[PDB]
Design a protein around this ligand. Structure first.
Ligand SMILES: Nc1ncnc2c1ncn2[C@@H]1O[C@H](COP(=O)(O)OP(=O)(O)OP(=O)(O)O)[C@@H](O)[C@H]1O
Ligand SMILES: Nc1ncnc2c1ncn2[C@@H]1O[C@H](COP(=O)(O)OP(=O)(O)OP(=O)(O)O)[C@@H](O)[C@H]1O
Lengths: 743, 679
């Protein structure tokens, strides 16, 4: 799979490289000209993928000229990966941010937009501004989208060829677009391509995080009095006592009905209770926001392990991109000791032995106390070193700078991801950055000195990483080890574990674990077994896998809400996009008036079988339509069920035409549209609140036994279909009963 | 006087520099032997300050490429006294400190430079080692985990460097030693404390404990650790707020050191608004005007959420800026580097103390930093273009600081503020408050506070009422002083235990320092026998009141001393009380003489010492536990119009007095009951 894709891509790389001379000979204007020229071709029905070699060749040359930098072949590969529904895994230091100029350019050609998704505003802003002169060189515009930005500025940012901004704010824009009353209010365009800069946090860790817009844009207060008023007779089964009372729920209904849920919430708040609240107007999770893009792609580092998750949550394939130089870091067999003490003793040994050959070491621990421990023992053994202490960030940046210096030893606690590159030999710019007026032959010096240090650290084996314990998450171990062997540099790594260590628990048999014990790891000595390393890694994988199972069940609950939100927003946007909702109105009125009479007159039925005590009233009650109708048919005996069905619809229409000559065609059309949006909104927010309740009234509504979800999907899909019909009927009522000072 | 008098000295040192420039390095190394010899012959240390400091300045010029500035000589002088030097950020505290360290190393008693953490202790011992080696002095470094022989060595160096924690710990472990040769520290001579706010104030009352199996075996607070030194001094920022505290906790004076260049930062009057919304609009508008003229702005807020709000509103206003987000370290350092760049706008949440310098115009050093292969005139173009930006930000007013809210502690406000106007640069600051602000609540009255709403403030009609700046500053001053009034009560209690530990460690040390404890043993044997006997034979009473049965058993049970006292008495109608007490002593001794003929004398001497120490350490451990219990019962034991304390002091005193008698007892019961096989 990865092997043959990569082969096929290496072939296209060789095409691109051969085009380099053509792009070189080209003037700056001629280069800017390729864009319109690709677009002309696309307009004539070219396939965008056929453009990859020339477009990449064009972007590569532009970047030589604007940035002074020329995409490496691995970067060309990474770019082609990101044209597909894929994650490019590119090792820290491989140049993700330059890589990303390639797919961003290519996927801008069709004029549909590109969303570059950064983790924070600083990078959005930084990247937009760094790339603006590149992409302007190429006749594209760039937009920057930020929180607080006004809507007209936002509209421009989204109308640029390429956009930068954080995941959050993309989401938030989406929601507010789905709260618009006119389509000119939208800031976004159709969601074309999302290129996510760091997928681990953005797509995975934060997959289920809801984006919520709330607004004290509540409404009602009556209920909390009504429902309170019942409570000063509640005196320490208990469903029935509650049920049978008032002018809400009269008709022998059920309160524990997933339907009366807001009510039940009212009573159970009123009982718990012994200015306006701001409800959710709109929600989406990130995972479901990303799933809306026609095309999705992104980048992460080589630390992987979550390929199975990207695939199942997002259908993102993943391509492991080679590094530009050979990755020669030596990841040695995990070692396993009886006790911590024995473990540390052999850790200190390793460090002793290495720092004496001039090799620098970075010790990653799982806690401060674990740090202080390995530290103090290093001091006991006479080994100089420094701890990165999270309280002294300044000291930490200075430590980190000399951390590749010969025989340097640095201890870090639960170390993060990416982090500052550690330069072997020490950093030599960090050194002239300290020189308040330098020279050519001071510089010469610093650098000569440094090459000698650097070549000696490489020759001593590069940065050695020591993991004093492993994490449950291998991704994290992998990020630790990944700080060594960057850009082809020698380095190595080794993890230590002991039988005393926390992680021993991940095997889930305590005695099955205590069998390595029976290889009693003798004091002086040591062996290495390749199967242990794979056991451990396998176990880390199984914990990850079971965690993701747990999470798949959560995402299934989520798919219920996604499916309902997609459908309803789809309906809302059909309406929004139409200036004239009138024929939709005509059809719903018919739907509503057929069903409404059906529930009183049975189709193709006998006058013997028709009723008014509730009908007659229902029509006056919900429609301000008063047809004292009994007599129509005892005074005009012949017409018939179908010529009358017709006739009531006709009336209703006549009262409506009447109100409209009074108000204005347009004014009316626009009101109806407004009513249909406002009512869909109301219902939907009601619906969301009710689902949230069920969903929590269902971590425990009942039983280890039967199926909680399932029943929940059914209840919830069911209320969504009820809401769909209640929307038709509530819109028609409104239009029927609307007051206007007449003739 | 002290400043104007110190300036005279500085004039002397300045006038000696031609002299010193004429000296070779070896001549300069030589002055240290010369100073010491003068000292041997009776010279007062303070008489050397001119020569010593001028030598240290020349040594620094040659070794560091740095010449101490005049204000730095002043600081170093201050630090020779029992005194806190206040020096503003950027003034070169670290170089300044080399002066008194040098001076106070000269008598050969040692110097402890106290650092907040192990990185700085090593960093500065190594940075300074060649300066001090240039001058014939050695440097020691003390770390946690360091073997005793290496610590012993660090403490034998002329000047030592380490954290407060490790210094204090060493002291307690030294006071758990069973031979004096085990001690790591020398007499506590001079402590130079680097960040006295954290080290001496915030942490004054924090106990350093050693436990074992779990229970406290040794304890001392930081205050009382530093109070052991003969000379104490320290450094902090002029961000003041705690001088009265230093005097009370430590008997340190404080001296504000003048900046090398004049301070010209314009700290404008504080501004009050009705609402948070009105506050932001005034902030936005300040930024707007200031950035349109090229001036950079740093904005400090009191939460993430308030940073956001101020951020979104700037954006809403079309003002580009960057938030410092604690989640993104690398971004933050990148942002900081250029936060002095024209019209830059930067927002920081609960800005934390000193922080990184903001170079006006931008940092150009982080420009050369960014190069792959920087080349001389790649630089000059960088430095020259920078000089233009720097001077344009200076002309524009330097860095403007905006507080969007004040913290209840003014030290925090002052640290935000102090980020501007460093080393003579132009700068300004403004703090914003609203009636909706949490701080309004420090006034402790709704209505008093709420009166100021009557100013009716009104947008683009803000006035400026100076009285309000000072009313605020006084409020923050009252809160501190309140909190310290309480703390002073808590230290009145700490002092009880302090004195008790002084007393008991003194004693213990006296024992430790000697190899023969015989005078004391013989002498406490008498005490113990008297008291034990007194319990059964009330002095000067008739025979009828004596419990000779009770005394017989007691001697057997606690002294393995089995005497037929009833037979003596009965057989010598002769023998009376005094004479009887003497027999009992004599016997105990003869029994002891005999074990000593077996065991050997020097073995016995050392047995007796070890027993005294160990018995002391057990009773003390017990005593600390019970002093703890007694103190936390402090509420309802002392009740209605006595002082609790007075009472606590009384109970404490009694309990300590009883322990010393009870120490005597157990030592002699042990020495009495020790089994030895008679051959
Ligand atoms: N083709 C290239 N030629 C020259 N310099 C490059 C090239 N590609 C990248 N660089 C430089 O290499 C560095 C590597 O890191 P970069 O900011 O791209 O992130 P990375 O480590 O791959 O991942 P991330 O960017 O997400 O932190 C950058 O300094 C970049 O300017
Ligand atoms: N006399 C001098 N000549 C040249 N440079 C000096 C001189 N004195 C101090 N410096 C430099 O001034 C800078 C600020 O000093 P230092 O690190 O002592 O900062 P500080 O804020 O005063 O001390 P601290 O960080 O301990 O609070 C340092 O980079 C230091 O080397």
């Amino acid at each position: 799979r990865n092997d043959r894709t990569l082969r096929r891509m290496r072939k296209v790389v060789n095409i691109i490289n051969a085009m380099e001379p053509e792009m070189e000979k080209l003037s700056d204007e001629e280069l800017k000209g390729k864009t319109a020229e690709f677009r002309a071709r696309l307009e004539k029905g070219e396939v965008l993928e056929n453009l990859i070699p020339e477009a990449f060749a064009v972007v590569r040359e532009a970047s030589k000229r604007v940035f002074g930098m020329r995409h490496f072949d691995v970067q060309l590969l990474g770019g082609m990966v990101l044209n597909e529904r894929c994650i490019a895994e590119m090792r820290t230091g491989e140049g993700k941010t330059l890589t990303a100029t390639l797919p961003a350019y290519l996927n801008a050609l069709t004029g549909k937009g590109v969303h570059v998704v950064t983790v924070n505003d600083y990078l959005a802003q930084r990247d937009a501004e760094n790339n603006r002169p590149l992409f302007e060189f190429l006749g594209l515009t760039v937009g920057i989208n930020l929180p607080g930005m006004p809507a007209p500025a936002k509209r421009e940012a989204y109308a640029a060829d390429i956009t930068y901004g954080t995941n959050n704010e993309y989401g938030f824009d989406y929601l507010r677009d789905n709260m618009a009353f006119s389509p000119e209010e939208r800031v976004q365009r159709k969601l074309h391509y999302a290129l996510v800069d760091e997928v681990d946090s953005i797509l995975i860790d934060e997959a289920r995080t809801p984006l919520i817009i709330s607004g004290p844009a509540e409404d009602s207060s009556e209920m909390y009095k009504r429902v309170n008023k019942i409570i000063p007779h509640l005196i320490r089964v208990l469903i029935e006592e509650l049920l049978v009372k008032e002018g809400i729920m009269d008709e022998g209904e059920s309160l524990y009905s997933p339907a009366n849920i807001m009510l039940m919430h009212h009573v159970t708040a009123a009982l718990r209770a012994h200015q306006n609240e701001n409800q959710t107007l709109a929600s989406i999770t990130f995972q479901n926001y990303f799933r809306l893009y026609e095309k999705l792609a992104g980048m992460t580092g080589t630390a992987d392990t979550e390929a199975f998750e990207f695939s199942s949550i997002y259908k993102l394939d993943t391509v492991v991109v080679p590094t530009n130089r050979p990755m020669i870091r030596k990841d040695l067999p995990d070692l396993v000791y009886m006790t911590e003490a024995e473990k540390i003793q052999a850790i200190i040994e390793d460090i002793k032995e290495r720092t004496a050959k001039g090799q620098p070491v970075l010790v990653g621990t799982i806690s401060i106390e674990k740090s202080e421990l390995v530290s103090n023992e290093l001091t006991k053994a006479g080994i100089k070193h420094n701890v990165l202490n999270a309280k002294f960030h300044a000291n930490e940046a200075a430590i980190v700078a000399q951390a590749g210096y010969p025989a340097a030893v640095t201890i870090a606690t639960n170390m993060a991801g990416r982090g500052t590159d550690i330069v072997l030999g020490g950093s030599w710019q960090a050194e002239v950055a300290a020189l308040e007026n330098p020279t050519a032959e001071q510089i010469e010096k610093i650098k000569a000195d440094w090459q000698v240090r650097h070549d000696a650290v490489l020759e001593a084996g590069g940065l050695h990483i020591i993991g004093t314990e492993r994490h449950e998450s291998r991704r994290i171990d992998n990020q630790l080890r990944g700080r060594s062997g960057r850009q082809g540099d020698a380095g190595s790594s080794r993890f230590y574990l002991s039988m005393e260590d926390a992680l021993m628990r991940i095997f889930a048999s305590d005695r099955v674990s205590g069998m390595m014990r029976k290889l009693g790891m003798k004091p002086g000595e040591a062996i290495e077994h390749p199967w242990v390393t794979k056991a451990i890694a396998n176990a880390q994988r199984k914990v990850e896998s079971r965690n993701f199972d747990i999470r798949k069940q959560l995402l299934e609950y989520d798919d219920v809400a996604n499916d309902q939100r997609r459908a309803i927003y789809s309906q809302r946007n059909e309406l929004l996009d139409v200036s004239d909702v009138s024929e939709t109105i005509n059809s719903i009125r018919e739907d509503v008036f057929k069903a409404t009479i059906d529930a009183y007159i049975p189709p193709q039925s006998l006058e013997e079988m028709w009723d008014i005590p509730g009908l007659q009233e229902r029509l006056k009650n919900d429609f301000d339509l008063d047809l004292p109708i009994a007599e129509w048919l005892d005074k005009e005996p012949e017409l018939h069920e179908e010529t009358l069905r017709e006739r009531i619809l006709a009336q209703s229409i006549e009262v409506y035409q009447r109100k409209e000559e009074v108000v204005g065609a347009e004014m009316m059309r626009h009101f109806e549209k407004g009513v249909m949006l406002q009512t869909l909104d109301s219902l939907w927010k009601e619906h969301l609140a009710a689902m949230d309740y069920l969903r929590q009234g269902i971590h425990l509504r009942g039983y280890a036994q039967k199926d909680p979800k399932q029943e929940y999907k059914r209840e919830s899909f069911s209320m969504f279909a009820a809401m769909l019909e209640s929307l038709k009927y509530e819109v028609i009522s409104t239009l029927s009963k609307v007051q206007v000072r007449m003739p």
